[PDB]
Motif scaffolding. Sequence first.
Motif, PDB file in Angstrom:
ATOM      1  N   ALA B  69      33.820  47.264  38.633  1.00  9.34           N
ATOM      2  CA  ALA B  69      33.711  45.979  37.959  1.00  9.34           C
ATOM      3  C   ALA B  69      34.517  45.999  36.668  1.00  9.34           C
ATOM      4  N   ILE B  71      34.769  43.741  33.400  1.00 10.77           N
ATOM      5  CA  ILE B  71      34.176  42.641  32.656  1.00 10.77           C
ATOM      6  C   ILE B  71      34.807  42.604  31.270  1.00 10.77           C
ATOM      7  N   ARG B  80      30.266  37.360  27.563  1.00 12.53           N
ATOM      8  CA  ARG B  80      30.716  38.214  28.649  1.00 12.53           C
ATOM      9  C   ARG B  80      31.330  37.385  29.773  1.00 12.53           C
ATOM     10  N   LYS B  81      32.223  38.018  30.532  1.00 13.55           N
ATOM     11  CA  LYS B  81      32.903  37.363  31.643  1.00 13.55           C
ATOM     12  C   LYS B  81      33.359  38.414  32.644  1.00 13.55           C
ATOM     13  N   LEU B  82      33.063  38.182  33.920  1.00 16.89           N
ATOM     14  CA  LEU B  82      33.440  39.099  34.988  1.00 16.89           C
ATOM     15  C   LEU B  82      34.842  38.761  35.481  1.00 16.89           C
ATOM     16  N   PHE B  85      35.666  42.471  40.830  1.00 13.30           N
ATOM     17  CA  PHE B  85      34.528  43.174  41.421  1.00 13.30           C
ATOM     18  C   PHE B  85      34.936  43.565  42.841  1.00 13.30           C
TER      19      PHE B  85
END
Lengths: 92, 92
Positions: B69, B71, B80-82, B85
């Motif tokens: 992942a 992020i 926060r931001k992904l 993945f």
Amino acid sequence: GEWEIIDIGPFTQNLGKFAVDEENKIGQYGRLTFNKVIRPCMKKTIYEQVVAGYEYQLYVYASDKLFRADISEDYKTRGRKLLRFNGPVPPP
Amino acid sequence: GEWEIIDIGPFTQNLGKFAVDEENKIGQYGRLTFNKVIRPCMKKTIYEQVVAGYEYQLYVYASDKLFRADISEDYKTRGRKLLRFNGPVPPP
């Protein structure tokens, strides 16, 4: 940027709980259940370079004598400061 | 850029007036009179590295599968931001 290793403590674990939660919203992998985060975890710092000020090395003549001056300047306030002033110096 | 030769002339001459004006306040060389600034004049730019944010690379286990992942976090908002993945991946 700059890279560093962080450990797998509660901050890092919650970073993993964040990623699994966001991925479960997308819904392409199927319902995932967070387990744990393992080493190595990498943290990257992103920087923006911006001008803090300037510096100048001068050769100035004054009263027919030659001196060496060292001035600094602030970018935002444009205020100057005299650091050194040595003379007489031989011409360059 | 760190060090550079700047030209002489109007902006450089005013630096020469400043250094003499400041030095006349101290007086160790006596009352001076600005004549001119001569070559070579050096300019040193000083930069400031400000943080724009962070990014984390994780190895996350979920439902007995191992994922990678990416992020991201903002320095000002702390949000926060992904980013990615992918998995399953081979363990390190």
